C-alpha cells in the first residue's frame, strides 16, 4: 500500500539536455506501471509491456532528456548516430522500455528555445549509460581559444520553434531500465 513516484520524472517541468541527461534511482516501490500508460512511442525490450506489473525487479532507473523527433529512433539498442554515440548510449542487451511524447506545447518557445544542448563530437564513443558533462573548448592547434580559428565548441543548441516540422520539434523521452542484482526484488507491482 505504498505507491511508486513515477510521476516525478514524467510530469517534470523541465527535462535535462541530452548531453547531460538526468538519472533517477527508483526503489522501495509498489510499482504500478499503469500511471505511465497520447505518447509518440512506447516500445519495450526483453520485457512484456502488457503485463509488466507482474514481472518485478531489484531496481529501476529512469533516464530523462529532451531531443528532436527525428532523433528518437537513435534511442534504441544497436543504433548509431550523433546521439547514440556521443550523447546517450544504450547497451545491446537492454531490458527495459523507452517512452516518448511530443512536447511542442511546452518547450517550443516562439522566441527560440536555446536551453537544450547536444554534443557534436567526442574523445571516444560512449559506453552504455555513460554521461559526459564537460563543456571545455577544444584546441586543434597550438593557440589558446580564450571561439576563433582551429577552436571548436563541443555543444550546439536545439533551436526549437513552434514553426518547425514534426521531425524538428522537441520530444520528451524517459527510458526505464530494469535490472536484477544479488538482492531480492524491491520494485514490484500491486498484489
Amino acid at each position, epitope marked *: 500500500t505504498n505507491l511508486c513516484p513515477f510521476h516525478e520524472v514524467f510530469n517534470a517541468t523541465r527535462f535535462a539536455s541530452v548531453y547531460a541527461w538526468n538519472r533517477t534511482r527508483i526503489s522501495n516501490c509498489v510499482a504500478d506501471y499503469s500511471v505511465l500508460y497520447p505518447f509518440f512511442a512506447f516500445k519495450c525490450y526483453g520485457v512484456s509491456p502488457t503485463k509488466l506489473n507482474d514481472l518485478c525487479f531489484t531496481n529501476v532507473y529512469a533516464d530523462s532528456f529532451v531531443i528532436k523527433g*527525428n532523433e528518437v*529512433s537513435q534511442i534504441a539498442p544497436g543504433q*548509431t*548516430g*550523433n546521439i547514440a*554515440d*556521443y550523447n546517450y548510449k544504450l547497451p545491446d542487451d537492454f531490458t527495459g522500455c523507452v517512452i516518448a511524447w511530443n512536447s511542442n506545447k511546452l518547450d517550443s518557445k516562439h522566441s527560440g528555445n536555446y536551453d537544450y544542448w547536444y554534443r*557534436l*563530437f*567526442r*574523445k*571516444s*564513443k560512449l559506453k552504455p549509460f555513460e554521461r559526459d558533462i564537460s563543456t571545455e573548448i*577544444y584546441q*586543434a*592547434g*597550438n593557440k589558446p581559444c580564450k571561439k576563433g580559428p*582551429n577552436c*571548436y565548441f563541443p555543444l550546439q543548441s536545439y533551436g526549437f520553434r513552434p514553426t518547425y516540422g514534426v*521531425g524538428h520539434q522537441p520530444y520528451r523521452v524517459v527510458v526505464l531500465s530494469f535490472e536484477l542484482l544479488h538482492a531480492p526484488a524491491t520494485v514490484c507491482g500491486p498484489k
Partner: antibody
Amino acid sequence: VQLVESGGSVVQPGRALRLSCAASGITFSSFGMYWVRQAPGKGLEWLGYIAYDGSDTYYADSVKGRFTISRDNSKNTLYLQMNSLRIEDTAVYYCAKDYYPLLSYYYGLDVWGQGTTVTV
Amino acid sequence: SVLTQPRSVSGSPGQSVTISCTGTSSDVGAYNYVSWYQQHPGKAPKFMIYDVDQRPSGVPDRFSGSKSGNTASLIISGLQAEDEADYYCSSYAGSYIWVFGGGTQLTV
C-alpha cells in the same frame, strides 16, 4: 590547412600503388580523414575513413579487403595502400578533413585536396 | 545502393531550382544526414549543406534544402551565372558507410 596530394602515376593492372597526402599545420592529429574517388565522366564514390587516433577504420564494400587506409601522426601524412589495381580503377583520388575534430563523422567533408590522378 | 539523381536540371538567372536525390528507407529516410557538395570543373568539391538544411560559414544564404520521406533536395534560389556546377548529395547508409549520389549538372 592545405592538403597536398601526391603518389599518382600510370601503372600496370595487378600491381600495388601507394597514395598519400600531406596536411599543412599541426591540426592533422586532431581530425579524422576520408578518402573519396572520382572516375572521369562519373560522380563521387566513398572509399573509406580513418579515425584521428588511428583506431577505427572503415571501408566502402567495393574496396573492402583490397585497400588499406593508414596514417602517420608524426609526419602529418595520410596514406592509401592500393592492391591488385584493376582496369576499372582509373580515377582521381582525394583526401578530406572531417568538418569537426575528434570523433564526429556524421557531418561532412570540409577540406579537400586537389586530387591525385591514377590510371591503368 | 547509390542515390538516384536527375542527370541535368534546367533554370535561368534570377529563378529558383530544386535538385532532388532519392534513396531507400534504409538510408535517406532512416537518417537525417544528407550533405550536399558543389564541384566546379578542374576543382575539388566544396562543402555546402550539412544535416539536410544547415550550412558552413562561407555558404551564401541562397543555398538551402529540405527532406521528406526518402527524398532529399537541394534548393537554390536567385540563381547567378557562377552557380553553374555539378552538385552531389551524400547520405549515411548505416554501419559507418556513406553513399554519394550519381551527381546532377546544373545549368543556367
